[PDB]
Amino acid sequence: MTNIQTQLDNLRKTLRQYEYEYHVLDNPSVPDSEYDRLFHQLKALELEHPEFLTSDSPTQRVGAKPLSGFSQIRHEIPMLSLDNAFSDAEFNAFVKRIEDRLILLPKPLTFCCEPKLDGLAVSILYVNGELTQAATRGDGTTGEDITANIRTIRNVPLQLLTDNPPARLEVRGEVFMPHAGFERLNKYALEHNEKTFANPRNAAAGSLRQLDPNITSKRPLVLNAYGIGIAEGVDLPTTHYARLQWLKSIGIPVNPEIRLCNGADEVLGFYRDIQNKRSSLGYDIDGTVLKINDIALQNELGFISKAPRWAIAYKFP
Amino acid sequence: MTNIQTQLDNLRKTLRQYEYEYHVLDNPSVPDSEYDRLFHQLKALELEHPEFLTSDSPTQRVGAKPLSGFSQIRHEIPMLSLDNAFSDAEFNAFVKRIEDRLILLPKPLTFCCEPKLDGLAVSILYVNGELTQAATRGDGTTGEDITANIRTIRNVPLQLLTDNPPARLEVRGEVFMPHAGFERLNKYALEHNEKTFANPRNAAAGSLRQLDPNITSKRPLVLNAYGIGIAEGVDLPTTHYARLQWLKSIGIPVNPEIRLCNGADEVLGFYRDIQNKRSSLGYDIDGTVLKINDIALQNELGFISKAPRWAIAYKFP
Numbered sequence: 001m002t003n004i005q006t007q008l009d010n011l012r013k014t015l016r017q018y019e020y021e022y023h024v025l026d027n028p029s030v031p032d033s034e035y036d037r038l039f040h041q042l043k044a045l046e047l048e049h050p051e052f053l054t055s056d057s058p059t060q061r062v063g064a065k066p067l068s069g070f071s072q073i074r075h076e077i078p079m080l081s082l083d084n085a086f087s088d089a090e091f092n093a094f095v096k097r098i099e100d101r102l103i104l105l106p107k108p109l110t111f112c113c114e115p116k117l118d119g120l121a122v123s124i125l126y127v128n129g130e131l132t133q134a135a136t137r138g139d140g141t142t143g144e145d146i147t148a149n150i151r152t153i154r155n156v157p158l159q160l161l162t163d164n165p166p167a168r169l170e171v172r173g174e175v176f177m178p179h180a181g182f183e184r185l186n187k188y189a190l191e192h193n194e195k196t197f198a199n200p201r202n203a204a205a206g207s208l209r210q211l212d213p214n215i216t217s218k219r220p221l222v223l224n225a226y227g228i229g230i231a232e233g234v235d236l237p238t239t240h241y242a243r244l245q246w247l248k249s250i251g252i253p254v255n256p257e258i259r260l261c262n263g264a265d266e267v268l269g270f271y272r273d274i275q276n277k278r279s280s281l282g283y284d285i286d287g288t289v290l291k292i293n294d295i296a297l298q299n300e301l302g303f304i305s306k307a308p309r310w311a312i313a314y315k316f317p
Numbered sequence: 318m319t320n321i322q323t324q325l326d327n328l329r330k331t332l333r334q335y336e337y338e339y340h341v342l343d344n345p346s347v348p349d350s351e352y353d354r355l356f357h358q359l360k361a362l363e364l365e366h367p368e369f370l371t372s373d374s375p376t377q378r379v380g381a382k383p384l385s386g387f388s389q390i391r392h393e394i395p396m397l398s399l400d401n402a403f404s405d406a407e408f409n410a411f412v413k414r415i416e417d418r419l420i421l422l423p424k425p426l427t428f429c430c431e432p433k434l435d436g437l438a439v440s441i442l443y444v445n446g447e448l449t450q451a452a453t454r455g456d457g458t459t460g461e462d463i464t465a466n467i468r469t470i471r472n473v474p475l476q477l478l479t480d481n482p483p484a485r486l487e488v489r490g491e492v493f494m495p496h497a498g499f500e501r502l503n504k505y506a507l508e509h510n511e512k513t514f515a516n517p518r519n520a521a522a523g524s525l526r527q528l529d530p531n532i533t534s535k536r537p538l539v540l541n542a543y544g545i546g547i548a549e550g551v552d553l554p555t556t557h558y559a560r561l562q563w564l565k566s567i568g569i570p571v572n573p574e575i576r577l578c579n580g581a582d583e584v585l586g587f588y589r590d591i592q593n594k595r596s597s598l599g600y601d602i603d604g605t606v607l608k609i610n611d612i613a614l615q616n617e618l619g620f621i622s623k624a625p626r627w628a629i630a631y632k633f634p
């Protein structure tokens with residue numbers, strides 16, 4: 001035991017807890033000036049005692065050397081994409097088909113509803129609570145290694161807030177750029193004879209394709225997790241909403257507008273509410289993502305790949 | 318000009334025309350004994366004058382040397398798979414969703430209906446009317462090279478019956494084994510202390526995985542084309558049924574039970590008719606494949622990959 005090691009462990013625990021409050025809860029217990037006091041005190045002490053430096057310390061988000069290119073990662077579980085609807089009647093048909101296809105339809109058919117973020121889908125692996133790798137969705141089978149870029153994201157924890165993390169946990173989420181950060185970036189880009197971005201999605205896509213993490217760190221990117229891939233050494237909740245509350249509870253950022261609706265009429269009320277809130281959110285959205293809440297009914301319904309919307313195989317009983 | 322070359326060109330034209338009559342029309346103009354008289358007369362003359370041997374001659378279906386393994390082929394256009402339904406109401410919802418999603422719905426919504434063959438999906442490329450390559454569907458992006466095995470199939474033409482073939486034409490179809498051939502194969506397999514097959518689909522899958530084409534040729538496999546991939550140097554028909562009639566007209570085998578139905582009620586009549594014919598067809602079927610006939614409405618509806626049946630993105634207008 002040494003005073004320095006004890007000092008470094010205390011600083012790291014305190015900074016991680018403040019980052020959770022500020023980023024995931026949006027309720028910081030201390031001023032930003034206090035968070036920075038502790039942060040650069042930790043950065044100073046680590047440099048004075050390099051033997052006690054850890055790769056997952058709050059001060060190690062930026063890889064000091066750029067990459068040459070991105071490697072290819074084949075996902076163990078395929079990253080899915082969503083099918084779409086453009087009207088209340090088309091949504092009501094998607095529901096009616098599910099009611100007919102399900103063996104047993106529950107009294108209230110519960111849906112977990114959320115705004116559809118206009119971002120980029122990513123997969124982030126935590127091995128024993130430590131961020132080891134991150135990849136883009138790509139084609140759903142193969143993506144690109146973006147580990148160094150994802151580590152730079154301020155609301156992405158380098159380690160999970162839990163004393164008993166899963167052996168392996170893969171978080172799937174959207175990386176986007178809020179309106180305020182996009183406006184700063186363009187003001188800076190135009191007043192430095194640099195490339196301006198048409199919209200925040202192009203700004204987010206361009207930031208994640210940077211080979212130098214030092215640039216990526218100066219791009220105000222944000223993550224909101226929507227789902228889990230690999231999950232080993234854990235009993236995941238049996239409803240989709242409970243899984244998102246569980247990710248939130250172990251340090252993962254999730255969207256605050258997520259609600260549970262019973263049946264198509266309540267789901268349509270959510271779509272209308274989110275449509276009227278569009279101008280006030282502070283980030284871009286394309287619509288609403290509506291899922292069946294019960295995980296057993298999801299497993300029963302399954303997935304499609306790669307099938308036309310103009311053909312169906314009516315199978316014999 | 319030589320008499321032998323003229324003799325070989327006449328034999329090849331006559332045999333190809335008889336194969337079309339026997340396999341695609343099911344109306345041979347001559348007895349099987351007559352077809353064989355000309356076939357082994359051609360085989361004899363080619364061996365006596367090896368300089369006039371062609372790789373696409375009716376006598377060159379079997380590669381005399383086995384393969385070591387199968388190479389991988391990435392399809393230029395992705396090979397799709399079908400979504401499914403299990404009831405009249407689930408089928409009626411799939412239709413109702415299309416009616417809501419289409420910008421303009423025509424007076425009769427016409428469907429091209431056919432029995433769902435219990436076979437294996439293959440892609441076959443014809444370059445200037447000559448069979449050059451063939452592959453399995455695989456995952457829809459990558460498949461395996463099965464050229465040597467597909468050439469052995471009696472109803473698969475080695476050259477298209479047309480004086481003006483497309484520059485490149487890719488035929489997509491099902492390879493299956495009819496009941497009569499499956500019964501012979503098992504009688505032979507059991508009376509030779511060899512492996513018997515549980516059903517004709519496993520018999521068909523096992524035949525196409527043979528590295529030696531000499532074995533594959535003794536397996537009574539059959540093709541029925543369901544669609545086109547690549548098509549260069551041709552104006553394809555604007556309805557799906559007309560494309561299948563066009564493939565039939567240039568020497569490609571297609572299923573004889575294909576019909577056009579207007580609306581869901583006529584389509585349900587087709588499903589019931591095919592369900593009652595199941596015991597009489599002479600090959601195995603899983604249900605019926607129902608497609609939108611108009612190719613412009615297909616292009617408008619598009620395809621999905623890889624999306625869950627339990628989620629939908631309701632997009633904003």
Ligand SMILES: Cc1ccc(Cn2cc(C(N)=O)ccc2=O)c(C)c1
Pocket residue numbers: 018019021022023028029030031032033035036154
């Ligand atoms: C100088 C400085 C420090 C920190 C922040 C924002 N912030 C605040 C906290 C906090 N209050 O617990 C935690 C993490 C974090 O990133 C800004 C904008 C500027």
Ligand SMILES: Cc1ccc(Cn2cc(C(N)=O)ccc2=O)c(C)c1
Pocket residue numbers: 335336338339340345346347348349350352353471
């Ligand atoms: C000996 C022999 C020859 C041919 C056939 C079958 N068949 C017949 C014709 C034909 N009639 O025009 C064309 C091709 C073909 O494969 C069998 C079963 C037996």
Ligand SMILES: Cc1ccc2cc(C(N)=O)cc(O)c2n1
Pocket residue numbers: 080081082115116117118119121174226227289628
């Ligand atoms: C399964 C899946 C895939 C992509 C998604 C993307 C979003 C999104 N763009 O917000 C939300 C979801 O719930 C998603 N869910």
Ligand SMILES: Cc1ccc2cc(C(N)=O)cc(O)c2n1
Pocket residue numbers: 311397398399432433434435436438491543544606
């Ligand atoms: C697009 C596509 C893909 C696979 C198919 C398979 C079959 C079949 N198994 O008969 C029929 C079709 O019309 C198909 N159509």
